[PDB]
């Protein structure tokens, strides 16, 4: 039997939801994103994540339309805070993205690794030994994943 | 002691280089599948990797017919234990 992460604290931990919908800033500020679209429907993801993780006893921490700097600042708080009484940390990023990065609504890039690395045992010892879960709902490029018959 | 980067689960909606899909009316393939799976399987005590596998399965079955497009979520993990989200 594998060990199982303790998952009994109430709440289990924070489920941060960075929910990026409005990319007007990106469109204004980043030439290559001039036509990047708002992420209509993302609210439904946020809602789904919220209800799902509430059910799982996470304290949902939504942040809408975060520029990259705001994302880092929000994440910093979670990175810095004391999760000792938490059993888990979940961060959902719903945004546009490209290879390895997610976009702030300002069209700035946040390398996913830059995000997740904020929660290493060193960065966030109170989460040491505790599951840190990041769900990244973003493109990771503009390629269409091809389908193959099976 | 455990590694600095232990106990991470990264649930990517898509493998690198590729789009992930968002239905403005329903949410994203990935997140919706994830939540569906979590809601359905966590009470069953299914661990997250099993769930993400199901997500992979589910999302893999979705099609962007216009572009003959697929989406392949891709979890990466350094979880050292089963990650379950119990009641």
């Amino acid at each position: 039997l594998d060990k199982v992460y303790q998952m009994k604290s109430k709440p289990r931990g924070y489920c941060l939801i960075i929910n990026n919908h409005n990319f007007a800033k990106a469109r204004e500020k980043v030439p290559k994103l001039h036509s990047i679209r708002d992420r209509n429907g993302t609210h439904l993801d946020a809602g789904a994540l919220t209800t799902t993780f509430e059910e799982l006893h996470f304290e949902i921490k939504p942040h809408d339309d975060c520029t990259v700097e705001q994302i880092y600042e929000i994440l910093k708080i979670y990175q810095l805070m004391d999760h000792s009484n938490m059993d888990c940390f979940i961060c959902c990023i719903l945004s546009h993205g490209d290879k390895g990065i997610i976009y702030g609504t300002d069209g700035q890039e946040a390398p996913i690794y830059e995000l997740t690395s904020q929660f290493t045992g060193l960065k966030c010892p109170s989460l040491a030994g505790k599951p840190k879960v990041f769900f990244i709902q973003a493109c990771q490029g503009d390629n269409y994943q091809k389908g193959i018959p099976v | 002691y455990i590694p600095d980067e232990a106990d991470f689960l990264l649930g990517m909606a898509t493998v690198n280089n590729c789009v992930s899909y968002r239905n403005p009316a329903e949410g994203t393939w990935y997140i919706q599948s994830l939540c569906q799976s979590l809601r359905e399987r966590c009470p069953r005590g299914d661990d997250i990797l099993t769930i993400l596998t199901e997500v992979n399965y589910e999302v893999s079955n979705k099609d962007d017919k216009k572009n003959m497009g697929k989406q392949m979520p891709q979890p990466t993990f350094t979880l050292r234990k089963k990650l379950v989200f119990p009641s």
Binding site: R37, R39, N40, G41, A138, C139 | S20, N23, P24, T28
Partner: peptide, 4 residues
Amino acid sequence: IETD
């Protein structure tokens, strides 16, 4: 359907 849209892409992120």
